[PDB]
């Protein structure tokens, strides 16, 4: 565009889409497990991915993935929910922080323990 | 906040003698571990990182402090690699090593941190103390008869003292004629590669 066109109407940037609206500017949010279940992934994958409908303290209810082999949380279990997308799962944009509040660390972890909330074993 | 593990493993991984000679570095052509003899690709990052790690494990400096040295050299006028090597050589433990009062830089760090040394009248136990020009490093009077000190006094004649230092071996006194230049630091790394690495 001409300089006069830029003067009359300047450049405008893009919108910069948000990824995790339910957190509302917080690194993680507390919630209650309104439902605990399993979901079949999208193709080409195939499994029984463990997820939970959680009512976060922001008043929004979202689906959160439960990582790691092992699971204890059930109905009305208080959880901490952080960001994180599961690619082969449409509509899952949050994960549950293992080792925090009611959810507990994965039992037999010995590598990458901190990411699954497993205390070091003597 | 100090590497205490084996140094021959690091020398073998980096492909060069980090310190010493006539040792377990007869297994030099391959890094440590089960997968040592395989052929390597060596990307540019790989090469750069190797040069940076060579300098780091040679001088006993961890990553945060090495990075700080890098920004200081980059801000300084002149060649960035020259200034970085000049800083690393101006470190006090390296000064003791180069003067030859220590068998190795690790021994120099040991004695410096233990305080067996005086800097122009004032006691210093900081290995990273940057020695300035015309400085006078002195052995502590109490510790003028350390076993490592007497070994160095027996062996220094074989050792080569750089032109920017004057040493009164038996007296334990390292006079700093001037802050060293690239031609005076021994060429064993690629400071240019390190500088390129710290730009990606």
């Amino acid at each position: 565009p001409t300089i006069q066109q830029l003067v009359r109407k300047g450049r405008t940037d893009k919108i910069s889409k948000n990824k995790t609206p339910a957190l509302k500017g917080s690194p993680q949010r507390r919630g209650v497990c309104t439902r605990v279940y399993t979901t079949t992934p999208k193709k080409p994958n195939s499994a029984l991915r463990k997820v939970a409908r959680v009512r976060l303290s922001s008043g929004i209810e979202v689906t959160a993935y439960i990582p790691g082999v092992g699971h204890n949380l059930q109905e009305h279990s208080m959880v901490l929910v952080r960001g994180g997308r599961v690619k082969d799962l449409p509509g899952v944009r949050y994960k549950i922080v293992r080792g925090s509040l009611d959810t507990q660390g994965v039992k037999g972890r010995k590598q990458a323990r901190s990411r699954y909330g497993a205390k070091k074993e003597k | 906040a100090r590497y205490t593990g084996p140094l021959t493993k690091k020398s073998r991984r980096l492909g060069t003698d980090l310190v010493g000679n006539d040792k377990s570095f007869e297994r030099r052509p391959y890094p440590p571990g089960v997968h040592g003899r395989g052929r390597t690709k060596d990307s540019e990052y790989s090469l750069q990182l190797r040069e940076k790690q060579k300098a780091r494990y040679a001088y006993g400096v961890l990553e945060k402090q090495f990075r700080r040295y890098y920004e200081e050299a980059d801000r300084a006028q002149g060649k960035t690699g020259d200034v970085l090597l000049q800083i690393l050589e101006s470190r006090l433990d390296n000064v003791v090593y180069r003067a030859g009062l220590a068998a190795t830089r690790r021994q120099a760090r040991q004695m410096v941190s233990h305080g067996h040394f005086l800097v122009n009248g004032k006691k210093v136990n900081i290995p990273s103390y940057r020695v300035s020009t015309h400085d006078i490093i002195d052995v502590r009077e109490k510790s003028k008869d350390l076993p490592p000190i007497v070994i160095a006094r027996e062996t220094f004649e074989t050792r080569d003292v750089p032109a920017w230092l004057e040493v009164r071996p038996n007296k334990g006194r390292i006079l700093v004629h001037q802050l060293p230049t690239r031609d005076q630091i021994v060429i064993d790394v690629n400071e240019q590669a390190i500088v390129e690495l710290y730009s990606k």
Partner: protein
């Protein structure tokens, strides 16, 4: 060895036939002397070593001189072949080759040791290499600038650049003798 070279990129191209696909390998090589002559070669083969060797021997016959004012570019340039735009600027000594992989390989083979190169436009390795190549070919050495303008280097070109050229020539003398 005598001539320093980098393999910029290799690609697995295929030709579909009635039976199936006939795969092949393409090789970009940059071969230079490290002092000002450099070239790039494209190689086609069924095998990586054959493609690389063909590219190298094709690059040998495409060596063009690059004007270095003491281990650095003479003056800023912007080259572009097809869609590969590459910007080059000279840098103070000790800056290094601040360039992307392919352009950095081209510059390192050409012998430039202090240069700032940016890759605008497409990121395809071949096109970026050609853009770096014609950016270097656009370089115009100060004596030939003076010949172009019918004047003298002391009348056309910056005193700092000329001086730095003299000190670079002096370190050259140093190395030579030392040998």
């Amino acid at each position: 060895n005598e001539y320093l070279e980098r393999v910029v990129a290799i690609n697995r191209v295929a030709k579909v036939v009635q039976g199936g696909r006939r795969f092949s390998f393409t090789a970009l090589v940059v071969v230079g002397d490290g002092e000002g002559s450099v070239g790039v070669g494209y190689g086609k083969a069924k095998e990586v070593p054959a493609a690389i060797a063909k590219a190298v021997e094709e690059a040998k016959k495409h060596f063009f001189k690059v004007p270095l004012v003491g281990r650095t570019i003479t003056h800023p340039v912007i080259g572009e072949k097809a869609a590969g735009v590459v910007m080059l600027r000279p840098a103070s000594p000790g800056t290094g080759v601040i360039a992307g992989g392919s352009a950095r390989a081209v510059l390192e083979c050409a012998g430039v040791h202090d240069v700032l190169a940016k890759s605008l436009g497409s990121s395809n390795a071949i096109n970026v290499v050609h853009a770096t190549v014609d950016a270097l070919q656009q370089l115009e050495e100060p004596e030939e600038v003076a010949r172009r303008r019918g004047k003298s280097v002391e009348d056309i070109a910056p005193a700092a650049m000329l001086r730095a050229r003299k000190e670079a020539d002096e370190a050259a003398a140093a190395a030579r003798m030392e040998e």
